[PDB]
Structure 1
Amino acid sequence: GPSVALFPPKPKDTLMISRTPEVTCVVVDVSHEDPEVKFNWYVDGVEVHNAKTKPREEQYNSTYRVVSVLTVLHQDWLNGKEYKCKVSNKALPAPIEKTISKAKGQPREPQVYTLPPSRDELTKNQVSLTCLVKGFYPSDIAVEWESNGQPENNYKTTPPVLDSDGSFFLYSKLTVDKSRWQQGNVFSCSVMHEALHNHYTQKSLSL
């Protein structure tokens, strides 16, 4: 029988007004015998009718996949509204329903701290610039490193880790050639999170 997964928008889409966040209902294991699928969408139980449902696509195991996509208002998602995908199929005695929303709980603002490389690291050709982001809830967050108004490529960020007070934390490591560091170039760790003013802050680091 059909299976339904429901996917949330990307944090960067919800945190920036000029972008379009979307919720995505994906149905799989749709039969050749019953290929036809109907989507109803609700926002806090209020049905809405502007979802874009895509034509079904047979997968390489002879089963169909049907995707329906609902654009969401930023404020609605951030105010914790519930988004419900109801999936009707002749092979379903009752419609499948999945619901999602933002993580519930008192949102908490991240604290952002940039840490220079350890003196011990200075004897190598590349150094580590560290951005610690802690005390934030929910775990959804986007962290980016940039320099001279441009993104940096050689950085990796740990996934969020549940800290002892129920908030989350992570670290982002930027690797740069030591010479760029010694020369006094300025680096910035940018953070986006719902509980920040304007959903945004940045901290800078340099010698």
Structure 2
Amino acid sequence: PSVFLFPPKPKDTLMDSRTPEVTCVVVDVSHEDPEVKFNWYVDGVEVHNAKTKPREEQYNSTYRVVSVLTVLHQDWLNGKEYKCKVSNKALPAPIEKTISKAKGQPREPQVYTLPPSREEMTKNQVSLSCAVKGFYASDIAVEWESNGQPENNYKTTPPVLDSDGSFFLVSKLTVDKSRWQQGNVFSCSVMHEALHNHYTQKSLSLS
């Protein structure tokens, strides 16, 4: 059996109303030795506000035991390291993994909206684009709105490392050509730690 450690979701660390969690996942737990132990440490000191989630049975007769430790938003953003220690009979030793936020000076996203190409104006649905570039580190959230309400027919590329060490991505919202032609306003909402209030939004409409 092997251990895998996962950071919080980007949006979770950026809004106080959300609950960021580090999650320790362990797999290949044979039914013969299905009892697993966890121990969590934050910046070298042990912590006890963690929990454990109910297990499952994978298709290969191996259990998948998990444990989520709730973290302070500011703890994670300030760089603290999260060590998860895993002990079991079938493992010769206690496995450990330490994870933290990427190191370095945060850099603010620049957000640019791009209207659909005229060539796409022959289709019944058109593509609205939100370029987000120059940000560091790569944790970011992007979503779309119209008239203050969610526009969910969108997909966003992962962050891509640019030649200057910052990241970019593009979000693509697909809407009915009719909606774009009447002049409705669409908005691209970006959250990132380096933005004021962790949030910014840019609009896009037919001129």
TM-score by length of 1: 0.92
**Structure 1 unaligned residues grouped into runs of 5+:** none
Aligned residues, how many?
A: 206
Q: Distance in 1 between matches of 2:181 and 2:33?
A: 66
Deviation at 1:22, TM superposition (A): 0.8
Q: Describe the shift of the 1:47–1:172 C-alpha distance in structure 2 as closer, same or farther (beyond 3 A).
A: same
Q: Deviations over 1:74-117 (max 9, x none)?
A: 00011111101001112333210011111122211100011122
Q: Is 68-77 or 121-130 further displaced after alignment?
A: 121-130
Q: Could you list the runs of 5+ residues in structure 2 that have no partner in the other structure?
A: none
Give the alignment's TM-score, normalised by structure 2.
0.92
2:179 counterpart SS class: helix
What is the Cα deviation at residue 205 of structure 1?
Answer: 1.0
Name the SS for the 2:143 alignment partner.
Answer: strand
In the superposition, relative to structure 1, how do residues 116 and 33 fare at CA in structure 2: closer, same or farther (>3 Å)? closer
Q: Deviations over 1:94-153 (max 9, x none)?
A: 210011111122211100011122333334332221111000111121111111111113
Matches of 2:120 and 2:89 in 1, distance apart? 64
Q: 1:32-66, CA deviations, whole angstroms, 9 ceiling, x for partnerless residues?
A: 44332211100011100121123544434333322
How big is each residue's C-alpha offset from its partner over 1:154-202, in whole Å with a ceiling of 9 and x where there is no partner?
2222221111101111111122222212211111000011111111000
CA distance in 1, matches of 2:185, 2:37: 53
Aligned position for 1:70: 69
Q: Distance in 2 between matches of 1:183 and 1:55?
A: 50
**Cα distance in 2 between the residues matched to 1:197 and 1:162:** 23
Q: Which moved more, 1:167-176 or 1:150-159?
A: 150-159
Task: Identify if the C-alpha distance between structure 1 residues 86 and 126 changes in structure 2 by more than 3 Å, giving closer, same or farther.
Answer: same
Distance (Å, rounded) in 2 between the aligned partners of 1:145 and 1:35: 44
CA distance in 2, matches of 1:131, 1:175: 12
Higher mean alpha-carbon deviation, 125-134 vs 114-123, is at: 114-123
Q: Distance in 2 between matches of 1:65 and 1:122?
A: 49
Alpha-carbon separation, structure 2, partners of 1:157 and 1:56 = 31
